[PDB]
Coordinates of C-alpha atoms in Angstrom, one line a residue:
Chain A
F1 CA -2.7 3.0 57.3
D2 CA -2.3 6.3 55.3
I3 CA -3.2 4.5 51.9
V4 CA -3.1 8.1 50.2
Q5 CA 0.6 8.3 51.4
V6 CA 1.1 4.6 49.7
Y7 CA -0.7 5.6 46.6
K8 CA 1.5 8.7 46.1
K9 CA 4.2 6.5 46.8
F10 CA 4.1 4.1 43.7
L11 CA 3.6 7.2 41.5
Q12 CA 7.0 8.6 42.2
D13 CA 8.0 5.1 42.6
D14 CA 7.7 4.5 38.9
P15 CA 7.1 7.0 36.3
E16 CA 5.4 4.2 33.5
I17 CA 3.0 3.4 36.3
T18 CA -0.9 4.8 35.6
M19 CA -3.1 6.1 38.2
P20 CA -5.8 3.5 38.0
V21 CA -3.0 0.9 38.5
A22 CA -1.4 2.6 41.5
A23 CA -4.6 2.6 43.2
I24 CA -4.7 -1.1 42.4
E25 CA -1.6 -1.7 44.0
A26 CA -2.5 0.5 47.0
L27 CA -5.6 -1.7 47.8
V28 CA -3.5 -4.7 47.2
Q29 CA -0.9 -3.6 50.0
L30 CA -4.0 -2.7 52.0
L31 CA -5.3 -6.4 51.2
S32 CA -2.0 -7.7 52.5
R33 CA -2.0 -5.8 55.9
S34 CA -5.5 -5.9 56.3
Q35 CA -6.4 -8.4 59.2
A36 CA -9.9 -8.7 58.1
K37 CA -11.4 -12.3 58.0
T38 CA -15.1 -10.9 57.8
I39 CA -17.0 -10.5 54.7
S40 CA -18.7 -7.6 56.9
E41 CA -15.2 -7.4 58.0
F42 CA -13.5 -8.4 55.1
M43 CA -15.5 -6.0 52.7
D44 CA -15.8 -3.3 54.9
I45 CA -12.2 -2.9 54.3
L46 CA -10.9 -1.0 51.2
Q47 CA -14.4 0.7 50.7
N48 CA -13.3 2.7 53.4
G49 CA -10.2 2.5 51.9
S50 CA -10.8 3.6 48.3
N51 CA -13.2 5.8 49.6
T52 CA -10.4 7.4 52.1
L53 CA -8.2 7.0 49.0
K54 CA -10.7 9.0 46.6
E55 CA -11.2 11.5 49.4
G56 CA -7.6 11.7 49.9
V57 CA -6.6 12.9 46.7
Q58 CA -8.3 16.0 45.0
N59 CA -8.6 14.9 41.2
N60 CA -9.6 11.4 41.7
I61 CA -11.0 10.1 38.5
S62 CA -8.1 7.9 37.1
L63 CA -7.6 6.2 40.6
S64 CA -11.4 5.7 40.8
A65 CA -11.0 3.7 37.5
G66 CA -8.5 1.5 38.9
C67 CA -10.4 1.4 41.9
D68 CA -13.7 0.3 40.2
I69 CA -12.1 -2.3 38.3
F70 CA -10.4 -3.7 41.7
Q71 CA -13.7 -4.2 43.9
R72 CA -15.6 -5.8 40.7
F73 CA -12.9 -8.2 40.5
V74 CA -13.2 -8.8 44.4
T75 CA -16.8 -9.4 44.6
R76 CA -17.2 -11.2 41.3
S77 CA -14.8 -14.2 42.6
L78 CA -16.4 -13.3 46.2
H79 CA -19.6 -14.4 44.6
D80 CA -18.9 -17.8 43.3
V81 CA -18.7 -19.9 46.7
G82 CA -15.9 -17.3 47.2
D83 CA -13.5 -17.6 50.1
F84 CA -11.7 -14.7 51.1
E85 CA -8.1 -15.6 51.7
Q86 CA -7.1 -17.1 48.3
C87 CA -8.0 -14.0 46.6
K88 CA -6.1 -12.3 49.2
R89 CA -2.7 -13.9 48.8
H90 CA -3.6 -14.2 45.0
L91 CA -3.8 -10.4 44.8
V92 CA -0.7 -9.7 47.2
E93 CA 1.1 -12.6 45.1
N94 CA 0.7 -11.4 42.0
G95 CA 1.1 -7.6 42.9
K96 CA 4.3 -7.7 41.0
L97 CA 2.5 -9.5 38.2
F98 CA -0.2 -6.7 38.1
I99 CA 2.0 -3.9 36.9
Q100 CA 3.3 -6.1 34.4
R101 CA 0.5 -6.3 31.7
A102 CA 0.1 -2.7 32.9
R103 CA 3.5 -2.1 31.0
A104 CA 2.6 -4.8 28.5
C105 CA -0.8 -2.6 27.6
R106 CA 1.0 0.4 26.9
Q107 CA 3.5 -1.6 24.4
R108 CA 0.5 -3.4 22.9
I109 CA -1.0 0.1 22.4
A110 CA 2.1 1.3 20.8
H111 CA 2.3 -1.6 18.6
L112 CA -1.0 -0.8 17.5
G113 CA -0.5 3.0 17.2
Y114 CA 2.9 3.3 15.3
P115 CA 1.3 2.4 12.0
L116 CA -1.1 5.5 12.1
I117 CA 1.9 7.5 11.5
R118 CA 3.0 7.2 7.7
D119 CA 6.1 8.3 6.1
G120 CA 6.2 12.1 5.8
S121 CA 3.1 13.0 8.1
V122 CA 3.4 16.1 10.8
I123 CA 1.8 14.8 14.1
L124 CA 0.3 17.1 16.8
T125 CA 0.0 16.6 20.5
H126 CA -0.9 18.4 23.6
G127 CA 1.3 18.2 26.6
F128 CA 2.9 14.8 27.7
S129 CA 1.6 11.4 27.4
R130 CA 3.4 8.1 28.0
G131 CA 1.3 6.3 25.8
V132 CA 1.4 9.1 23.0
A133 CA 5.3 8.7 23.5
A134 CA 5.1 5.4 23.4
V135 CA 3.5 5.3 20.1
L136 CA 5.7 8.0 18.5
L137 CA 8.7 6.4 19.5
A138 CA 7.9 2.9 18.2
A139 CA 7.2 4.4 15.0
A140 CA 10.8 6.2 15.1
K141 CA 12.8 2.8 15.5
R142 CA 11.1 1.5 12.5
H143 CA 12.9 4.4 11.0
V144 CA 9.7 6.3 9.8
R145 CA 10.2 9.8 8.6
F146 CA 7.9 12.2 10.7
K147 CA 7.9 15.5 12.3
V148 CA 5.9 16.5 15.7
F149 CA 4.3 19.8 17.0
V150 CA 4.1 19.8 20.5
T151 CA 1.9 22.5 22.7
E152 CA 3.4 24.2 25.2
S153 CA 0.5 22.6 28.0
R154 CA -0.3 25.3 30.6
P155 CA -0.3 25.2 33.5
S156 CA 1.5 21.6 33.8
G157 CA 4.4 22.8 31.2
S158 CA 4.4 19.3 29.9
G159 CA 5.0 20.7 26.5
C160 CA 9.1 20.9 27.4
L161 CA 9.2 17.3 28.7
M162 CA 7.5 15.6 25.7
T163 CA 9.5 17.9 23.4
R164 CA 12.9 16.6 24.7
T165 CA 11.7 13.1 25.0
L166 CA 10.9 13.1 21.1
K167 CA 14.1 15.1 20.8
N168 CA 16.4 12.3 22.1
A169 CA 14.7 9.8 19.6
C170 CA 16.4 12.1 16.7
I171 CA 12.4 13.3 16.0
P172 CA 12.0 16.6 14.6
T173 CA 10.0 18.7 17.0
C174 CA 8.6 22.3 17.5
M175 CA 6.5 23.9 20.1
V176 CA 3.4 25.8 19.6
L177 CA 1.7 28.0 22.2
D178 CA -1.9 27.1 23.4
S179 CA -3.1 30.2 21.5
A180 CA -1.4 29.1 18.2
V181 CA -2.6 25.3 17.9
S182 CA -5.6 26.5 15.5
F183 CA -3.0 28.1 13.3
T184 CA -1.0 25.2 13.0
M185 CA -4.1 22.7 12.0
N186 CA -3.4 23.1 8.3
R187 CA 0.2 21.7 8.7
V188 CA -1.0 18.7 10.9
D189 CA -1.8 15.5 9.4
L190 CA -2.8 13.6 12.6
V191 CA -3.5 14.7 16.2
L192 CA -2.7 12.3 18.9
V193 CA -3.3 12.7 22.5
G194 CA -3.5 10.6 25.5
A195 CA -6.1 10.4 28.3
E196 CA -6.1 10.1 32.3
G197 CA -9.5 8.6 32.1
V198 CA -12.5 7.5 29.4
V199 CA -15.8 7.9 30.5
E200 CA -18.9 5.6 29.8
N201 CA -19.9 7.2 26.2
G202 CA -16.3 7.1 25.4
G203 CA -15.3 10.4 26.3
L204 CA -11.7 11.6 27.4
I205 CA -11.0 13.2 30.7
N206 CA -7.2 14.8 29.9
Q207 CA -5.4 18.0 30.2
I208 CA -6.9 21.4 30.1
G209 CA -6.1 22.0 26.6
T210 CA -7.0 18.6 25.1
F211 CA -10.6 19.5 24.0
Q212 CA -9.5 22.4 22.1
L213 CA -7.3 20.3 19.7
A214 CA -9.9 17.9 19.2
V215 CA -12.2 20.8 18.1
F216 CA -9.7 22.5 15.9
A217 CA -9.2 19.1 14.4
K218 CA -12.7 18.6 13.7
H219 CA -12.7 21.9 12.1
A220 CA -9.5 21.3 10.0
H221 CA -11.0 17.7 9.1
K222 CA -7.9 16.0 10.8
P223 CA -7.8 12.7 12.3
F224 CA -8.0 12.8 16.4
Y225 CA -6.4 9.7 18.1
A226 CA -6.8 9.2 21.9
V227 CA -4.4 6.7 23.4
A228 CA -5.5 5.2 26.9
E229 CA -5.1 2.0 28.5
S230 CA -8.0 -0.1 29.1
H231 CA -7.9 0.3 33.0
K232 CA -8.9 3.7 32.5
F233 CA -12.3 3.1 31.5
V234 CA -14.5 4.5 34.3
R235 CA -18.4 4.2 34.7
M236 CA -19.3 8.0 35.0
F237 CA -21.3 9.9 32.5
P238 CA -20.5 13.6 32.3
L239 CA -23.6 15.5 30.8
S240 CA -21.4 18.2 29.4
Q241 CA -17.7 18.7 28.6
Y242 CA -17.9 20.8 31.9
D243 CA -19.6 18.2 34.2
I244 CA -16.9 16.7 36.2
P245 CA -16.1 16.8 40.3
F246 CA -14.1 19.7 40.8
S247 CA -11.0 19.5 43.3
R248 CA -10.6 23.4 43.9
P249 CA -13.3 26.2 43.5
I250 CA -12.9 27.3 39.8
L251 CA -13.5 30.1 37.7
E252 CA -14.7 32.6 40.2
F253 CA -14.5 36.2 40.1
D254 CA -13.2 39.2 41.9
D255 CA -15.5 41.9 43.8
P256 CA -13.9 45.2 43.2
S257 CA -15.9 48.2 44.7
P258 CA -14.2 51.6 44.7
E259 CA -11.2 49.8 46.0
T260 CA -8.4 52.2 45.2
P261 CA 0.1 49.8 25.2
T262 CA 1.1 46.3 23.9
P263 CA 2.2 45.2 20.2
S264 CA 1.3 42.1 19.0
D265 CA 5.0 40.9 18.2
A266 CA 6.0 41.8 21.6
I267 CA 6.9 38.9 23.7
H268 CA 6.5 39.2 27.3
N269 CA 7.1 35.8 29.0
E270 CA 6.6 37.9 32.5
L271 CA 3.1 38.7 31.7
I272 CA 1.6 35.3 32.7
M273 CA -0.8 34.5 35.4
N274 CA 0.1 33.8 38.9
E275 CA -0.5 30.4 40.5
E276 CA -3.0 31.9 42.8
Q277 CA -5.1 32.7 39.5
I278 CA -4.2 29.3 37.9
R279 CA -5.7 27.7 40.8
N280 CA -8.8 29.4 39.8
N281 CA -8.5 27.7 36.4
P282 CA -9.4 23.7 35.4
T283 CA -7.0 21.3 35.5
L284 CA -8.6 19.0 33.3
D285 CA -11.4 19.3 30.2
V286 CA -13.8 16.5 28.8
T287 CA -13.6 15.6 25.1
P288 CA -16.9 14.2 23.5
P289 CA -16.6 11.0 21.7
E290 CA -17.6 12.7 18.5
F291 CA -14.2 14.5 18.4
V292 CA -12.4 11.0 18.6
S293 CA -11.6 9.4 15.5
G294 CA -10.3 6.1 16.9
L295 CA -9.5 5.2 20.6
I296 CA -6.3 3.2 20.8
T297 CA -6.3 0.9 23.7
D298 CA -4.7 -2.7 24.5
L299 CA -8.1 -4.0 23.6
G300 CA -7.3 -2.5 19.8
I301 CA -8.6 0.6 18.1
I302 CA -11.9 1.2 19.4
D303 CA -13.9 3.3 16.8
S304 CA -17.4 2.6 18.0
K305 CA -17.4 4.3 21.3
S306 CA -20.5 2.4 21.9
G307 CA -17.8 0.0 22.2
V308 CA -16.0 1.7 25.6
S309 CA -19.8 1.3 26.9
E310 CA -19.6 -2.4 25.9
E311 CA -16.7 -3.1 28.1
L312 CA -17.9 -1.4 31.2
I313 CA -21.2 -3.2 30.4
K314 CA -19.0 -6.5 30.6
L315 CA -17.3 -5.4 33.5
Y316 CA -20.5 -4.7 35.4
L317 CA -22.3 -8.4 35.4
Chain B
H1 CA -9.6 -25.2 -28.5
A2 CA -5.8 -26.6 -28.3
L3 CA -3.7 -23.6 -29.0
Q4 CA -0.2 -23.4 -29.5
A5 CA 2.4 -20.4 -29.7
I6 CA 6.1 -20.1 -31.4
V7 CA 8.4 -17.5 -29.4
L8 CA 11.3 -16.5 -31.0
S9 CA 13.5 -15.5 -28.3
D10 CA 17.3 -14.5 -29.2
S11 CA 16.1 -12.7 -32.3
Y12 CA 16.7 -9.0 -31.0
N13 CA 20.0 -10.2 -29.1
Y14 CA 22.4 -8.3 -31.0
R15 CA 21.1 -5.0 -29.9
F16 CA 21.5 -4.9 -26.5
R17 CA 25.0 -6.4 -26.9
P18 CA 27.0 -5.2 -24.2
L19 CA 24.4 -6.9 -22.0
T20 CA 23.3 -10.1 -23.2
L21 CA 26.5 -11.5 -22.9
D22 CA 26.1 -12.6 -19.2
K23 CA 22.4 -13.0 -19.3
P24 CA 20.4 -13.2 -22.7
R25 CA 18.1 -10.6 -23.9
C26 CA 14.8 -12.5 -22.8
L27 CA 16.1 -12.9 -19.4
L28 CA 16.8 -8.8 -19.2
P29 CA 14.7 -7.1 -16.3
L30 CA 12.5 -4.6 -17.5
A31 CA 11.0 -2.9 -14.5
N32 CA 12.7 -5.9 -12.1
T33 CA 11.1 -8.5 -14.1
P34 CA 12.6 -10.8 -16.7
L35 CA 11.3 -9.7 -20.3
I36 CA 10.3 -13.5 -21.2
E37 CA 7.8 -13.4 -18.4
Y38 CA 5.8 -10.6 -19.7
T39 CA 5.5 -12.9 -22.9
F40 CA 4.6 -15.8 -21.0
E41 CA 1.7 -13.8 -19.1
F42 CA 0.5 -12.5 -22.2
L43 CA 0.3 -16.1 -24.3
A44 CA -1.4 -17.3 -20.9
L45 CA -4.0 -14.8 -21.2
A46 CA -4.3 -15.5 -25.0
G47 CA -5.3 -19.1 -23.8
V48 CA -2.0 -20.6 -25.4
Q49 CA -1.9 -24.3 -24.3
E50 CA 1.7 -25.1 -26.2
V51 CA 4.7 -22.8 -26.2
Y52 CA 8.0 -23.5 -28.2
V53 CA 10.9 -20.9 -27.5
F54 CA 13.3 -20.7 -30.1
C55 CA 16.9 -19.6 -28.8
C56 CA 20.6 -19.8 -28.8
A57 CA 22.6 -17.4 -27.0
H58 CA 22.7 -18.6 -23.4
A59 CA 20.0 -21.0 -24.7
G60 CA 21.3 -23.0 -21.4
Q61 CA 20.6 -20.3 -18.9
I62 CA 17.4 -19.7 -20.9
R63 CA 16.3 -23.2 -20.3
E64 CA 17.4 -23.4 -16.8
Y65 CA 14.9 -20.6 -16.1
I66 CA 12.0 -21.8 -17.8
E67 CA 13.0 -25.1 -16.1
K68 CA 12.7 -23.2 -12.6
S69 CA 10.1 -20.9 -13.6
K70 CA 6.3 -20.5 -12.8
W71 CA 5.5 -22.2 -15.9
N72 CA 7.1 -25.6 -15.5
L73 CA 4.6 -26.2 -12.6
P74 CA 1.4 -28.6 -12.7
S75 CA -0.7 -25.4 -12.5
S76 CA 0.9 -23.6 -15.6
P77 CA -1.7 -22.9 -18.2
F78 CA 0.4 -24.1 -21.1
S79 CA 3.5 -26.5 -21.7
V80 CA 6.8 -24.7 -22.8
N81 CA 9.4 -26.5 -24.8
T82 CA 12.8 -25.0 -26.0
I83 CA 14.4 -25.0 -29.2
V84 CA 18.2 -24.8 -29.4
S85 CA 19.2 -24.1 -33.3
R86 CA 22.3 -22.3 -34.8
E87 CA 22.3 -18.7 -33.6
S88 CA 20.9 -15.7 -35.8
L89 CA 17.6 -17.2 -36.9
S90 CA 15.6 -15.3 -39.3
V91 CA 11.8 -16.0 -38.8
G92 CA 11.6 -17.9 -41.8
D93 CA 14.5 -20.4 -40.7
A94 CA 12.6 -21.1 -37.5
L95 CA 9.3 -21.7 -39.3
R96 CA 10.9 -23.9 -42.2
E97 CA 12.4 -25.8 -39.2
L98 CA 9.4 -25.7 -37.5
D99 CA 7.8 -27.4 -40.8
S100 CA 10.2 -30.1 -40.6
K101 CA 9.0 -31.5 -37.2
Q102 CA 5.0 -31.2 -37.8
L103 CA 5.2 -29.6 -34.5
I104 CA 2.3 -27.3 -35.7
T105 CA -1.0 -28.7 -35.3
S106 CA -3.9 -26.0 -35.9
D107 CA -3.4 -21.9 -35.9
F108 CA -0.8 -20.4 -33.9
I109 CA 0.9 -17.2 -32.5
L110 CA 4.0 -16.1 -33.8
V111 CA 6.1 -13.4 -32.1
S112 CA 9.7 -12.3 -32.1
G113 CA 11.4 -11.1 -29.1
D114 CA 9.6 -10.2 -25.8
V115 CA 6.1 -9.0 -26.0
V116 CA 4.6 -7.1 -23.3
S117 CA 0.7 -6.9 -23.8
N118 CA -2.8 -7.4 -21.9
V119 CA -4.8 -7.5 -25.2
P120 CA -6.8 -10.8 -25.1
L121 CA -6.4 -12.8 -28.1
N122 CA -9.3 -14.9 -27.4
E123 CA -11.6 -12.7 -29.7
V124 CA -9.0 -12.2 -32.5
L125 CA -8.8 -15.9 -32.6
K126 CA -12.5 -16.7 -32.8
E127 CA -12.4 -13.9 -35.6
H128 CA -9.4 -15.7 -37.4
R129 CA -10.9 -18.9 -36.7
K130 CA -14.4 -18.2 -38.1
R131 CA -12.8 -16.3 -41.0
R132 CA -10.9 -19.7 -42.1
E133 CA -14.1 -21.4 -41.4
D134 CA -15.4 -20.2 -44.5
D135 CA -12.4 -19.7 -46.8
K136 CA -9.1 -21.4 -45.9
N137 CA -6.9 -19.3 -48.2
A138 CA -6.6 -16.9 -45.4
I139 CA -3.3 -17.9 -43.7
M140 CA -2.6 -14.9 -41.2
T141 CA -4.2 -12.3 -39.0
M142 CA -2.0 -9.4 -37.7
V143 CA -2.8 -7.9 -34.3
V144 CA -2.2 -4.3 -34.5
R145 CA -2.8 -1.3 -32.1
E146 CA -4.6 1.9 -32.9
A147 CA -2.4 4.9 -32.1
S148 CA -1.3 8.3 -33.8
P149 CA 1.4 8.6 -36.1
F150 CA 3.9 10.1 -34.0
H151 CA 3.1 8.3 -31.2
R152 CA 5.9 7.5 -28.9
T153 CA 5.5 3.6 -28.7
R154 CA 5.2 4.1 -32.7
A155 CA 8.7 3.3 -33.8
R156 CA 10.7 2.6 -37.0
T157 CA 9.4 -1.0 -37.2
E158 CA 5.8 0.1 -35.9
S159 CA 5.8 2.8 -38.6
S160 CA 4.0 1.4 -41.3
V161 CA 1.0 2.1 -43.8
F162 CA -1.8 -0.3 -43.8
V163 CA -4.6 -0.4 -46.4
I164 CA -7.5 -2.3 -45.1
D165 CA -10.9 -3.5 -46.3
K166 CA -13.3 -1.5 -43.9
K167 CA -15.9 -4.4 -43.9
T168 CA -13.9 -7.6 -44.5
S169 CA -10.7 -6.2 -42.3
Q170 CA -8.6 -7.6 -45.0
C171 CA -5.2 -6.0 -45.5
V172 CA -4.8 -5.3 -49.4
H173 CA -1.7 -3.4 -48.9
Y174 CA 1.4 -3.0 -46.3
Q175 CA 4.4 -0.7 -46.8
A176 CA 7.1 0.0 -44.0
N177 CA 7.7 3.7 -43.5
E178 CA 11.1 4.4 -44.9
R179 CA 12.6 7.6 -45.5
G180 CA 13.0 8.7 -49.1
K181 CA 9.8 6.7 -50.0
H182 CA 7.4 9.6 -50.5
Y183 CA 4.7 7.7 -51.9
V184 CA 2.0 5.3 -51.5
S185 CA 1.6 3.1 -54.9
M186 CA -1.4 0.7 -55.0
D187 CA -2.1 -1.6 -58.1
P188 CA -5.4 -0.3 -59.3
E189 CA -6.9 -3.6 -59.4
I190 CA -7.6 -4.0 -55.9
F191 CA -10.4 -1.2 -56.1
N192 CA -12.5 -3.2 -58.3
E193 CA -13.3 -6.1 -55.7
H194 CA -12.6 -4.0 -52.4
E195 CA -14.3 -0.4 -52.6
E196 CA -14.3 1.1 -49.0
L197 CA -10.8 0.9 -48.1
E198 CA -8.9 2.5 -45.2
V199 CA -5.3 4.1 -45.5
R200 CA -3.9 4.0 -42.1
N201 CA -0.7 5.4 -41.0
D202 CA -1.8 5.7 -37.3
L203 CA -1.1 2.0 -36.8
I204 CA 1.1 0.4 -34.5
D205 CA 2.6 -2.6 -36.3
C206 CA 3.0 -5.0 -33.0
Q207 CA 3.9 -8.1 -35.2
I208 CA 1.9 -10.4 -33.0
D209 CA 0.7 -12.3 -35.7
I210 CA -2.0 -15.2 -35.7
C211 CA -0.9 -17.9 -38.3
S212 CA -2.4 -21.0 -39.7
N213 CA -1.0 -24.5 -39.7
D214 CA -0.2 -24.0 -43.7
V215 CA 2.4 -21.0 -43.0
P216 CA 5.0 -23.5 -41.8
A217 CA 4.9 -25.5 -45.3
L218 CA 4.2 -22.1 -47.1
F219 CA 7.9 -21.6 -45.9
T220 CA 9.5 -24.4 -46.7
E221 CA 8.1 -23.4 -50.3
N222 CA 9.4 -20.0 -51.0
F223 CA 12.3 -20.6 -49.3
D224 CA 13.9 -16.9 -50.0
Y225 CA 11.4 -15.8 -46.9
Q226 CA 13.4 -14.1 -44.0
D227 CA 11.1 -11.5 -42.4
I228 CA 7.7 -12.1 -41.7
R229 CA 7.1 -8.6 -42.8
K230 CA 9.5 -7.5 -45.1
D231 CA 9.0 -10.7 -47.5
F232 CA 6.4 -13.1 -46.5
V233 CA 3.8 -10.2 -46.5
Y234 CA 5.3 -8.7 -49.5
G235 CA 4.7 -12.1 -51.2
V236 CA 1.3 -12.6 -50.3
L237 CA 0.3 -9.0 -51.6
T238 CA 2.6 -9.1 -54.8
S239 CA 1.2 -12.6 -55.3
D240 CA 4.3 -14.8 -54.8
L241 CA 1.8 -16.9 -53.0
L242 CA -0.8 -16.8 -55.5
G243 CA -4.2 -17.2 -53.8
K244 CA -3.6 -16.0 -50.0
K245 CA -5.1 -13.5 -48.1
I246 CA -4.1 -11.9 -45.0
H247 CA -5.9 -9.4 -42.3
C248 CA -5.8 -7.2 -39.7
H249 CA -7.1 -7.1 -36.0
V250 CA -7.0 -3.3 -35.3
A251 CA -7.0 -3.5 -31.3
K252 CA -8.7 -0.5 -29.9
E253 CA -7.9 -1.0 -26.3
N254 CA -5.2 -2.4 -23.8
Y255 CA -1.6 -2.3 -24.8
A256 CA 0.5 -4.1 -27.3
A257 CA 4.3 -3.4 -27.9
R258 CA 7.4 -5.6 -28.2
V259 CA 11.1 -4.9 -26.7
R260 CA 13.4 -4.8 -29.9
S261 CA 15.3 -1.5 -29.5
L262 CA 17.5 0.0 -26.4
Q263 CA 14.7 2.9 -26.6
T264 CA 11.7 0.7 -26.9
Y265 CA 13.1 -1.3 -23.7
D266 CA 12.9 2.4 -22.2
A267 CA 9.6 3.1 -24.0
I268 CA 7.6 0.1 -23.1
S269 CA 9.1 0.1 -19.3
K270 CA 7.6 3.5 -18.3
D271 CA 4.5 2.4 -20.1
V272 CA 4.6 -0.2 -17.7
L273 CA 5.5 1.8 -14.6
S274 CA 2.4 4.1 -15.9
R275 CA -0.5 1.4 -15.5
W276 CA -0.9 1.1 -19.2
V277 CA -0.8 -2.7 -19.0
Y278 CA -2.5 -3.8 -16.1
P279 CA -2.7 -6.1 -14.2
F280 CA 0.9 -6.8 -15.4
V281 CA 2.0 -4.0 -13.4
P282 CA 5.0 -3.8 -10.4
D283 CA 2.7 -3.9 -7.6
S284 CA 0.6 -6.7 -9.0
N285 CA 3.8 -8.9 -7.6
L286 CA 3.5 -11.8 -9.9
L287 CA 6.7 -13.0 -9.3
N288 CA 6.0 -12.8 -5.4
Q289 CA 7.6 -9.6 -5.2
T290 CA 6.8 -7.0 -2.5
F291 CA 6.0 -3.9 -4.5
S292 CA 3.7 -1.1 -3.3
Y293 CA 2.0 1.7 -5.7
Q294 CA 2.2 5.3 -4.3
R295 CA 1.5 8.7 -5.9
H296 CA 3.3 10.3 -8.7
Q297 CA 3.9 6.5 -10.1
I298 CA 6.8 5.4 -7.3
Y299 CA 7.1 1.8 -6.8
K300 CA 8.9 0.4 -3.7
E301 CA 9.5 -3.1 -2.5
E302 CA 9.5 -3.8 1.5
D303 CA 12.8 -3.8 3.4
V304 CA 13.9 -0.6 1.2
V305 CA 15.5 2.0 3.7
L306 CA 15.6 5.9 2.7
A307 CA 17.7 8.2 4.1
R308 CA 16.1 11.4 5.4
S309 CA 16.9 14.4 3.0
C310 CA 16.7 12.0 0.2
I311 CA 14.5 13.0 -2.4
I312 CA 12.9 10.1 -4.7
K313 CA 10.7 11.6 -7.4
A314 CA 8.2 10.5 -9.9
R315 CA 8.0 7.5 -12.0
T316 CA 10.9 5.8 -9.4
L317 CA 11.0 1.9 -8.9
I318 CA 13.1 0.8 -6.1
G319 CA 13.6 -3.1 -5.6
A320 CA 14.0 -4.7 -2.0
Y321 CA 17.2 -4.0 0.3
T322 CA 18.2 -1.0 -1.9
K323 CA 19.9 1.6 0.3
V324 CA 20.2 5.5 -0.5

């Protein structure tokens, strides 16, 4: 059934979908084509299916979150004198009626987020995030006068896409290098980032340059807001900002044996790292909750971030 | 305590007279708020329970606003009635007329034009009351505000020399500050019964007077009196009225001033943009506006769209639905 192929399938299907939701839709259309009819048969199922899904995509955190939400909805109404089939249709029936809220969650976020931008302020964002864009755009329509710094986000290069996205809405933009983010913090009134996933302690898993912005923000005494939908909450507890499942081997060294001038103003765009080297660098980092001012979700703005824990507590019994 | 107040609208109506042709003077907006409302809020603060508004120029539109106003409601602190008499009333004329009606009951407040203030007259009253309780020949106590002589809010009319008994707070001398008048001439007899006097050129004559029920009758008598300061006060002092005493209440806090000139209108209005007369401030929204205070004293209502590259600078107030 090649669940993986499907999961990737939505992802291209619809730019506005989230990796967790794409995993939920995956399991649904497996639950459609799933002959099943044994709880043993019925529940043996996805687990090999999300497992197969988890092992089929290399960075798996976000889809694992959407997964984790799915089965807990499954067993919690399979508990309850649970019959199988009524959930099997009801999930396949309302699958369209899932990527409904997921889209409504983002809009709910933007309606909560945009007042954080007030007249004459300068925003800083790292890379491209649909949620961040949603918040910024929603503020723009209300004729709010603001400007946005966008970090050239290597390796993804998401900075260009976000810059153009904001340029289309007549929002004044300016791109900054990953090395110049600290120098710009004095001109920044607010920092706004998205997140692929939010861990148990309310920490952020996102693009590799995220935590550096949160660090500069803390140092420059500027508010740092994260933008993520509720279904990005995942039960996993990184013990450091380095503790995550690695897709590829990372940060390993050369082994040379006897193997046989630049000014600072000089601009050498041809002097960047190659992709062989870049595949040795991480794709994601972790941002501790003590760097996050408030976490904007569809559930509202979570400042406690013992509250993200509260939600994951409710999810599991 | 049943208190009443007499507001002489239409008084300085001639000064603003390219305006005051469509509207009246008391309906002119100071900071997007009709001047009459400042007066009403001040009287309501003072604890007035009965208001009489003398008016003529557009007395219909005045009476209409008051009819449709905040102060014609069951919740209104006082009861406001209006008096329409032949235009260009002097203060004496209104008071003499006031006597023919036996409208005045007890002690009352007499203001001419429109007053912008946040001074609680409550304690000024009790001072005036207890002063009359001991001696009933004390007929008026004038509320004045401490200042500096060259003070910006201290204009031609407010610029006067007072001499007050430092203990009894009784005014034993008043003289308006005119040019060419280079002296202060006191009758030496004052000194053998008042003995620590204070000559004051630092006061702002707000002309917010707390008068007794005698005063209207005292204006029927001495029918030559027109101005409350120029004739009446001069009369009591130089003894046209034989046995009368008047007092001063020099307020040391808050704000008092009257909108009489075009320049005073400018002066007071920006004293209002500055929070000098709180809570009577644009962003308090007493007439249910939507003002908000921002730094450098800029006030903006809602539904106001600003173009980008537009520069609204300090001390600026923008009404709703306004575009730049």
